[PDB]
Design an enzyme around this catalytic site. Sequence first.
Site, PDB file in Angstrom:
ATOM      1  N   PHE A  59     -26.400  21.013 -33.623  1.00 14.67           N
ATOM      2  CA  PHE A  59     -25.473  21.186 -34.727  1.00 14.67           C
ATOM      3  C   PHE A  59     -24.523  20.075 -34.737  1.00 14.67           C
ATOM      4  O   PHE A  59     -23.873  20.094 -33.709  1.00 14.67           O
ATOM      5  CB  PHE A  59     -24.895  22.517 -34.798  1.00 14.67           C
ATOM      6  N   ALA A  60     -24.823  19.318 -35.767  1.00 14.54           N
ATOM      7  CA  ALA A  60     -23.875  18.078 -35.759  1.00 14.54           C
ATOM      8  C   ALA A  60     -22.787  18.168 -36.902  1.00 14.54           C
ATOM      9  O   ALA A  60     -23.085  17.762 -37.898  1.00 14.54           O
ATOM     10  CB  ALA A  60     -24.657  16.613 -35.772  1.00 14.54           C
ATOM     11  N   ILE A  61     -21.859  18.763 -36.935  1.00 16.39           N
ATOM     12  CA  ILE A  61     -20.822  19.059 -38.088  1.00 16.39           C
ATOM     13  C   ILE A  61     -19.599  18.065 -37.853  1.00 16.39           C
ATOM     14  O   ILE A  61     -19.080  17.757 -36.617  1.00 16.39           O
ATOM     15  CB  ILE A  61     -20.514  20.480 -38.099  1.00 16.39           C
ATOM     16  N   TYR A  64     -18.747  15.431 -34.946  1.00 18.64           N
ATOM     17  CA  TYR A  64     -19.778  15.108 -34.070  1.00 18.64           C
ATOM     18  C   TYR A  64     -21.120  14.379 -34.489  1.00 18.64           C
ATOM     19  O   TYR A  64     -21.820  14.013 -33.420  1.00 18.64           O
ATOM     20  CB  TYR A  64     -20.263  16.579 -33.728  1.00 18.64           C
ATOM     21  N   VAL A 130     -24.684  18.562 -29.173  1.00 18.09           N
ATOM     22  CA  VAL A 130     -24.958  17.069 -29.689  1.00 18.09           C
ATOM     23  C   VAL A 130     -24.029  16.090 -28.941  1.00 18.09           C
ATOM     24  O   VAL A 130     -24.669  15.067 -28.632  1.00 18.09           O
ATOM     25  CB  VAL A 130     -24.603  16.957 -31.145  1.00 18.09           C
ATOM     26  N   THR A 163     -15.896  33.522 -16.053  1.00 17.56           N
ATOM     27  CA  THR A 163     -14.965  33.755 -17.348  1.00 17.56           C
ATOM     28  C   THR A 163     -15.457  34.511 -18.469  1.00 17.56           C
ATOM     29  O   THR A 163     -15.667  34.275 -19.414  1.00 17.56           O
ATOM     30  CB  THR A 163     -14.422  32.385 -17.889  1.00 17.56           C
ATOM     31  N   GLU A 221     -20.518  31.592 -26.172  1.00 21.01           N
ATOM     32  CA  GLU A 221     -20.993  31.698 -24.775  1.00 21.01           C
ATOM     33  C   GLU A 221     -20.638  32.980 -24.082  1.00 21.01           C
ATOM     34  O   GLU A 221     -21.324  33.502 -23.141  1.00 21.01           O
ATOM     35  CB  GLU A 221     -20.141  30.689 -24.151  1.00 21.01           C
TER      36      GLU A 221
HETATM   37  C1  LIG Z   1     -14.019  26.279 -12.034  1.00 20.87           C
HETATM   38  C2  LIG Z   1     -12.949  25.562 -12.817  1.00 20.87           C
HETATM   39  C3  LIG Z   1     -13.460  25.328 -14.303  1.00 20.87           C
HETATM   40  C4  LIG Z   1     -13.916  23.709 -14.668  1.00 20.87           C
HETATM   41  C5  LIG Z   1     -14.927  23.821 -15.960  1.00 20.87           C
HETATM   42  C6  LIG Z   1     -14.477  24.148 -17.300  1.00 20.87           C
HETATM   43  O1  LIG Z   1     -15.442  24.031 -18.236  1.00 20.87           O
HETATM   44  C7  LIG Z   1     -15.491  24.910 -19.161  1.00 20.87           C
HETATM   45  O2  LIG Z   1     -15.529  26.355 -18.971  1.00 20.87           O
HETATM   46  C8  LIG Z   1     -15.394  27.362 -20.298  1.00 20.87           C
HETATM   47  C9  LIG Z   1     -15.591  28.514 -19.647  1.00 20.87           C
HETATM   48  O3  LIG Z   1     -14.781  29.210 -18.987  1.00 20.87           O
HETATM   49  C10 LIG Z   1     -16.233  26.761 -21.346  1.00 20.87           C
HETATM   50  O4  LIG Z   1     -17.499  26.989 -20.981  1.00 20.87           O
HETATM   51  C11 LIG Z   1     -15.959  25.104 -21.663  1.00 20.87           C
HETATM   52  C12 LIG Z   1     -16.273  24.449 -20.409  1.00 20.87           C
HETATM   53  O5  LIG Z   1     -15.869  22.984 -20.642  1.00 20.87           O
HETATM   54  C13 LIG Z   1     -16.980  22.147 -21.237  1.00 20.87           C
HETATM   55  O6  LIG Z   1     -17.888  21.833 -20.119  1.00 20.87           O
HETATM   56  C14 LIG Z   1     -17.361  21.338 -19.022  1.00 20.87           C
HETATM   57  C15 LIG Z   1     -18.443  21.157 -18.161  1.00 20.87           C
HETATM   58  C16 LIG Z   1     -16.933  19.973 -19.171  1.00 20.87           C
HETATM   59  O7  LIG Z   1     -17.854  19.109 -19.986  1.00 20.87           O
HETATM   60  C17 LIG Z   1     -15.544  19.996 -20.372  1.00 20.87           C
HETATM   61  O8  LIG Z   1     -15.129  18.821 -20.848  1.00 20.87           O
HETATM   62  C18 LIG Z   1     -16.269  20.862 -21.551  1.00 20.87           C
HETATM   63  O9  LIG Z   1     -15.014  20.935 -22.593  1.00 20.87           O
END
Ligand SMILES: CCCCCCO[C@@H]1O[C@H](CO)[C@H](O)C[C@H]1O[C@@H]1O[C@@H](C)[C@@H](O)[C@@H](O)[C@@H]1O
Length: 263
Positions: A59-61, A64, A130, A163, A221
């Site tokens: 999905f490229a909105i 993006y 994406v 989480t 998620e």
């Molecule tokens: C253990 C400490 C956390 C470090 C990673 C945080 O990742 C983020 O996790 C949340 C869920 O709690 C969600 O999945 C977004 C995710 O962040 C993205 O994915 C990570 C791997 C990086 O690429 C970020 O830049 C993204 O925003």
Amino acid sequence: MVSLPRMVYPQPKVLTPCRKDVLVVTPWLAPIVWEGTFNIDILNEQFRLQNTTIGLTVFAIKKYVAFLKLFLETAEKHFMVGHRVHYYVFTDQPAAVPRVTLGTGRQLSVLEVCERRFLSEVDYLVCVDVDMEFRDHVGVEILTPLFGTLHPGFYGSSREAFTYERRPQSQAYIPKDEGDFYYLGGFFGGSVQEVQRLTRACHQAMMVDQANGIEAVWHDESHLNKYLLRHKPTKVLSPEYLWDQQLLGWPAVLRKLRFTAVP
Ligand SMILES: CCCCCCO[C@@H]1O[C@H](CO)[C@H](O)C[C@H]1O[C@@H]1O[C@@H](C)[C@@H](O)[C@@H](O)[C@@H]1O
Ligand SMILES: [Hg+2]
Ligand SMILES: [Hg+2]
Ligand SMILES: [Hg+2]
Ligand SMILES: [Hg+2]
């Protein structure tokens, strides 16, 4: 279905573990895909003989759409090379989709924003974000009725640290004593039937929560994790399939970085 041909390859060693640093199979006997656990030559044969077609959805909105070029270009170099692939780009700017050159047997459909369609065009659906780029092989070793991917930031964490949604009010609620792994919302897939069932269950769960004036901590998620807890995936991809080198570096446990975030 059909018989495999004669093939010459290293004999598997019954008394020699694939990896001694990671878990390569879940408690419900689904393999956990790590480099070193599979012979891609055998797997390619098995799937080519079935004339397997893989759909890749993105999905490229809005902004993006700018990630599409690098996404599609790298996909052409590392995604299911040798098999039939059908890209489905859901976008709000059809005219902004870059004109990328595709290898034979590969096509792209731009849908501006019917399930049945997928049922007749592809055998498997792979759903990803994406703003990513393939940096290494991502092939048929991932294909299975249902698969989830280990989040690159929680694979070594304890469940209580995950989480997950922790509010009993939400449909995506998961207590502290439950949970196998924390899966990523940005890389999951399986047969068209299983993927449609998962998204259908998720959409309904999200509606119920909305009607009750609540939104899970990590939205989609969070619901994916709840679904995969109750319906175990038949394969689990290691963090090799979705990593962020800028944020996490390159651990020794990762012999390959196949799909990564675009800084
Ligand atoms: C253990 C400490 C956390 C470090 C990673 C945080 O990742 C983020 O996790 C949340 C869920 O709690 C969600 O999945 C977004 C995710 O962040 C993205 O994915 C990570 C791997 C990086 O690429 C970020 O830049 C993204 O925003
Ligand atoms: Hg092995
Ligand atoms: Hg999808
Ligand atoms: Hg959803
Ligand atoms: Hg979902």
